[PDB]
Design a binder for these strands. Sequence first.
DNA 1: AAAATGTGACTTTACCCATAACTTTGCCGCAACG
Length: 70
Amino acid sequence: MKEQFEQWVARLQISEAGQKIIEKVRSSEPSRRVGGGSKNVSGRYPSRKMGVTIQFESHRVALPIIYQLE
DNA sequence: AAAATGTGACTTTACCCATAACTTTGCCGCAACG
């Protein structure tokens, strides 16, 4: 899981700052919890690619992008 | 930090259908005048 990541970074030759920010993203939990607001349907989707739940704040402008990325 | 869910069982006007009930009105006779 980590050796493949390192080889991917080496192949793309990502700078130290970029790899650091990527590791911070892949380690840190989401910054804010999704709130429904007032006109947005919010919620969770099971991403089998990652294998975890992903939060979306809109089911007709952001969720379809999630399906595409899955 | 943020766009996308009204809905359906219940009740109510509206038109048609059949019949009762009073008023219309042409088709006929009958009395009166020319």
